[PDB]
Design a protein around this ligand. Structure first.
Ligand SMILES: Nc1ncnc2c1ncn2[C@@H]1O[C@H](COP(=O)(O)OP(=O)(O)NP(=O)(O)O)[C@@H](O)[C@H]1O
Ligand SMILES: [Mg+2]
Lengths: 44, 426, 315
C-alpha cells in the first residue's frame, strides 16, 4: 500500500545547469526556455 | 400580426450585426451631390460624450449600412432619409446616434421623437438610447405609451420622446403635452411592422404633418415591400433612399440527406441511432404537431438527453430564455413546432433535423422555410448537415419537389450500416 | 526528439489497439454488426450529452461511462447492453470513446469555447480511473492536431501539396480541401479542450491519486513552441486560446516563472511574427496582443469564461 507523489514541479535534481540559470534570471532568453517545469524554490 | 412579435424576439436574441456582403445602393435626391461615405467614427467628428458612448457599447467602426447613413443624416442642411435593410444591420443604432447628436443639452423640452409600433419594441429602442447616451448627464427619456398615465396640466421636460403611434398623437395635440414645432428629428422605426395595423399608418402621418419643415424626417424598414414603399413616401417628403439587398443564403456548403421510416418510433429510433454515429454537438428538430413535439422531447429526455422545448403557449420572453440557454450550451437539442421555425442563429448547431417536412399550408413545400432553416448553418463556407424524416409516400413526394427547386441532391440515408453514417459529414 | 519519440510511442501504441479488436470492425454478419452498432452507440452518446446545465447531472454521464468501461451493464435505447458480450468490445469501446472526446472538442468546443470545461472534467476523471483511455486520447488528439504535441510538420521534399496539407491536419477529400477558416477553429477547439483537461480534476469520489496529465504539460507546451519559429496564422491563434483557457491556472502554479514567459513573447516573440505574417493575416496576431497588453499590466489573467463554478457543482 503506497500512494505516489506528483511531478507538477521538477526537483532541483534532474535539472541541468543551463536550466537552473534560466529560472534564476529576471528575463528569459529567447529560444532557450526550459522544457521541464520550474522547481518549488524559484517561484519567487 | 406575428411580425411585431418576431421583431421583438429578434431584438432580445440578437448579440451582434448580421454581416452582409452586398454593396449598398444610394439614391440621393440631388444626384449632382457627391456620395457620402465614411469608414470610421472619427471622420464623422461626433461630440466627445457621444463618441465616448459609441466606443463604450462595443462599436469599433460603422456597419455597412451606417457607412452611408450616418454622414447623410449629419450633413448640413438636414437631409431626410428612407433606409431599407434587413433586421440586424444596425438601423436602430443609426438613428439613435443621429438623434443624440442633434439634441441641445440645456433645453428642457422634446427635441426628438420616435414612433415604435408597440410598447415592448419602444422599450428596446429606449434601451439603446440609454446606453449610447449614458455620458449625457441630465439627458432623460420619456415613454409616451398607453399605460403611462399622466396628470392633466403636466409639461414634459425630457429632450427625447418615444411612444406608440396612437398615444404620441394625443401627447402633441389634444393633451398639449408636447409642442410639435420644437421637434428637430423624427423617426419611424420598423415601418414594415407599422403598416400591419391600419390605425398606425394614419396616426403616424398626422403626427408627421404637425412637425416643422426643417425637421429631419427619418424612416426605417426591414422589408422592401410595396405597401411599405408606398407608405414611406407619404411620411418622408423630398427623401433620400438607401437600400441593402437581403443576404441570400445557400446550400452550397450543406450536405442534405433523408431517411425512410415506417412510423414515429422508427423516426425516433432513426434519430437515436444516429447520435452514436457522428460528431454531433447541438441540433434542432422541427416537428409538425405540438402533440408530437412534446412526445419526442419527452422520449428524448427519457433516454437521459438534455433537451429544450419551444412551444407556442410560452410567452415571448420565455422563448428567449430557452433560446439563450440553448446558445449557452445548457440544452443540447431544441425541439420546436411553429415557434421560430424559419431559422435561429445558434452557432454551435451541427445538424438540422426535419422530423416532419417544412410544409406550407395547402400542402406544398415551404422552400423559403427550408432554405432559411438550413441557410443559418453554413454561411460564408461553414459546413452543416440536414436530415429529413420521411414517414410516407406523400411526404416522399414533397421531398423530391424540394430537391427540384434547389437543384441539390438529397441523398438517401440508411440509419443502419454505421460505416456509411460516419462518412456523412466528415 | 524526447517529445517526438514519446509522440510515436502513443501513435504506434494506438495502432496496436486498432489491431487488437481487428475482426470486430471487419465483420459483416448480422449479429456482428448489431454488436458493433450497440457498443459504439452506448459509448459515444453520453459524451455528446455533456452539457453546461449542472454538475449534478454531469455525474450521470460519468457513472454511465464508468459502468460501461468497468464492465457493468448500461441502460441503452431499448435493451440494456454491456461489454461482457465480447472480449474485443472493451478494447474497442476504449478506442471509440477516446476519439469522441477529441471529436467533441473538434466540433463543439471550436464553436462554443465554454463547453470545453464540462467535457474536460469528465475526461480528466475517466483518465484517472482508466489510464488506458487517456493514452488513446493523447493518440487521437495528437494526429488530428499535431500542433498540440506540439510539433510543426515539416515539408518532406519531392511530394505533392495535397499530400502535405493532410499532414497539417486539414480535412481533405478527392477534390475538396478544407478552407483555412473552417480549419483554424477545428484546431482551436482541440487545444482549448487540451488546455482545460490539464487544469481540471474530477471532484467526486474523493481520490487521493494525482492528475494523470498534470499541469506540467501546459508549461512544456508553451515552452516547446515559443522556442521555435512561429507559423503565420496557426501559432498566433493557438497561442492565444491556450493562454485564455489555462493562463489562469499556470499563473497561480508557476507564479513568477510564468510571467517571465509572458514578458518574453511580448518583446521577443511578437517581433518573430510581425515579419512572418503577411498583412492579410494579422487578425490572429492582433488578438494575441490585445490579450497580453491587459494581462501584463493587470498582473492577472482572467479566469476562462465558462469555468465550472461552485454553483454548477452543487446545483
Ligand atoms: N456598429 C456596430 N458594431 C457592432 N455591433 C453593432 C453595431 N451597430 C449595432 N450593433 C449591434 O447589432 C445588433 C443589432 O442592432 P440594431 O440597431 O437593433 O439592428 P437592426 O436594424 O437595427 N434591427 P431591427 O430594428 O429589428 O431592424 C445589436 O446587438 C447592436 O448592439
Ligand atoms: Mg430598428
Amino acid at each position: 500500500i503506497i500512494a505516489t507523489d506528483n511531478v507538477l514541479f521538477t526537483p532541483r535534481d534532474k535539472l541541468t545547469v543551463e536550466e537552473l540559470e534560466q529560472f534564476q534570471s529576471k528575463k528569459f532568453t529567447l529560444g532557450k526556455i526550459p522544457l521541464k517545469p520550474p522547481p518549488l524554490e524559484l517561484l519567487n | 400580426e406575428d411580425r411585431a412579435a418576431q421583431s421583438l424576439l429578434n431584438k432580445l436574441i440578437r448579440s451582434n450585426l448580421v454581416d452582409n456582403t452586398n454593396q449598398v445602393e444610394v439614391l440621393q435626391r440631388d444626384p449632382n451631390s457627391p456620395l457620402y461615405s465614411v469608414k470610421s467614427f472619427e471622420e464623422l467628428r461626433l461630440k466627445p460624450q457621444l463618441l465616448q458612448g459609441v466606443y463604450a457599447m462595443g462599436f469599433n467602426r460603422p456597419s455597412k449600412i451606417q457607412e452611408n447613413a450616418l454622414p447623410l443624416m449629419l450633413a448640413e442642411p438636414p437631409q431626410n432619409l428612407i433606409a431599407q435593410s434587413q433586421s440586424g444591420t444596425g438601423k436602430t443604432a443609426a438613428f439613435v446616434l443621429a438623434m443624440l447628436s442633434q439634441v441641445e443639452p440645456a433645453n428642457k423640452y422634446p427635441q426628438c421623437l420616435c414612433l415604435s409600433p408597440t410598447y415592448e419594441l419602444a422599450l428596446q429602442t429606449g434601451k439603446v438610447i440609454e446606453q449610447m447616451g449614458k455620458f449625457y448627464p441630465e439627458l432623460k427619456l420619456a415613454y409616451a405609451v398607453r399605460g403611462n398615465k399622466l396628470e392633466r396640466g403636466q409639461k414634459i421636460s425630457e429632450q427625447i420622446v418615444i411612444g406608440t403611434p396612437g398615444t404620441v398623437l394625443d401627447w402633441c395635440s389634444k393633451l398639449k403635452f408636447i409642442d410639435p414645432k420644437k421637434i428637430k428629428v423624427f423617426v419611424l422605426d420598423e415601418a414594415d411592422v407599422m403598416i400591419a395595423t391600419q390605425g398606425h399608418q394614419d396616426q403616424s402621418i398626422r403626427i408627421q404633418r404637425m412637425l416643422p419643415r426643417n425637421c429631419q424626417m427619418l424612416l426605417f424598414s426591414a422589408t422592401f415591400e410595396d405597401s411599405v414603399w408606398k407608405f414611406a413616401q407619404k411620411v418622408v417628403p423630398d427623401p433620400n433612399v438607401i437600400k441593402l439587398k437581403r443576404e441570400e443564403e445557400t446550400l452550397d456548403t450543406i450536405k442534405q440527406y433523408y431517411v425512410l421510416c415506417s412510423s414515429r418510433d422508427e423516426k425516433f429510433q432513426a434519430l437515436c441511432n444516429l447520435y452514436g454515429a457522428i460528431t454531433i454537438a447541438q441540433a434542432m428538430i422541427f416537428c409538425h404537431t405540438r402533440k408530437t413535439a412534446s412526445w419526442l422531447a419527452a422520449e428524448l429526455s427519457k433516454e437521459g438527453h438534455q433537451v429544450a422545448l419551444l412551444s407556442g403557449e410560452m410567452m415571448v420572453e420565455q422563448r428567449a430564455a430557452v433560446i439563450e440557454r440553448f446558445r449557452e450550451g445548457k440544452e443540447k437539442v431544441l425541439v420546436t413546432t411553429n415557434v421560430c421555425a424559419r431559422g435561429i442563429d445558434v452557432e454551435q448547431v451541427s445538424v438540422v433535423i426535419n422530423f416532419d417536412l417544412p410544409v406550407d399550408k395547402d400542402g406544398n413545400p415551404d422552400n423559403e422555410t427550408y432554405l432559411h432553416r438550413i441557410g443559418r448553418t453554413g454561411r460564408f463556407g461553414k459546413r452543416g448537415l440536414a436530415v429529413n424524416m420521411v414517414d410516407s409516400k406523400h411526404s416522399m413526394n414533397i421531398l423530391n419537389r424540394i430537391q427540384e427547386h434547389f437543384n441539390k441532391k438529397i441523398e438517401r440515408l440508411d440509419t443502419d450500416d454505421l460505416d456509411e453514417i460516419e462518412k456523412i459529414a466528415n | 526528439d524526447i517529445t517526438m519519440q514519446w509522440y510515436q510511442q502513443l501513435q504506434d501504441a494506438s495502432m496496436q489497439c486498432v489491431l487488437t479488436f481487428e475482426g470486430l470492425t471487419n465483420s459483416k454478419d448480422s449479429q456482428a454488426k448489431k454488436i458493433k452498432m450497440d457498443l459504439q452507440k452506448a459509448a459515444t452518446i453520453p459524451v455528446s450529452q455533456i452539457s453546461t446545465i449542472a454538475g449534478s447531472k454531469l455525474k450521470e454521464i460519468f457513472d454511465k461511462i464508468h459502468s460501461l468501461l468497468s464492465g457493468k451493464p448500461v441502460q441503452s435505447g431499448g435493451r440494456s447492453v454491456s461489454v461482457t458480450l465480447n472480449p474485443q468490445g472493451l478494447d474497442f469501446v476504449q478506442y471509440k470513446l477516446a476519439e469522441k472526446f477529441v471529436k467533441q472538442g473538434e466540433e463543439e468546443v471550436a464553436s462554443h469555447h465554454e463547453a470545453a470545461f464540462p467535457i474536460a472534467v469528465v475526461a480528466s476523471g475517466i483518465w484517472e480511473l482508466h489510464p488506458r483511455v487517456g493514452d488513446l486520447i493523447l493518440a487521437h488528439l495528437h494526429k488530428k492536431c499535431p500542433y498540440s504535441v506540439p510539433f510543426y510538420p515539416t515539408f518532406k521534399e519531392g511530394m505533392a501539396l495535397e499530400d502535405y496539407q493532410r499532414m497539417l491536419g486539414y480535412q481533405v477529400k478527392d477534390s475538396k480541401v478544407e478552407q483555412q477558416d473552417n480549419f483554424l477553429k477545428r484546431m482551436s477547439g482541440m487545444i482549448r479542450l487540451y488546455a482545460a483537461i490539464i487544469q481540471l480534476r474530477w471532484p467526486y469520489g474523493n481520490r487521493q491519486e494525482i492528475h494523470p496529465h498534470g499541469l506540467n504539460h501546459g508549461w512544456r507546451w508553451l515552452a516547446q513552441i515559443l522556442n521555435m519559429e512561429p507559423l503565420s496564422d496557426v501559432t498566433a491563434t493557438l497561442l492565444f486560446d491556450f493562454l485564455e483557457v489555462c493562463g489562469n491556472a499556470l499563473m497561480k502554479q508557476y507564479q513568477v516563472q510564468f510571467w517571465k514567459m509572458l514578458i518574453l513573447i511580448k518583446e521577443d516573440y511578437f517581433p518573430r511574427i510581425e515579419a512572418i505574417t503577411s498583412s492579410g493575416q494579422m487578425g490572429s496576431f492582433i488578438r494575441l496582443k490585445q490579450f497580453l497588453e491587459k494581462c501584463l499590466q493587470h498582473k492577472d489573467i482572467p479566469v476562462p469564461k465558462g469555468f465550472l463554478t461552485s454553483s454548477f457543482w452543487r446545483s
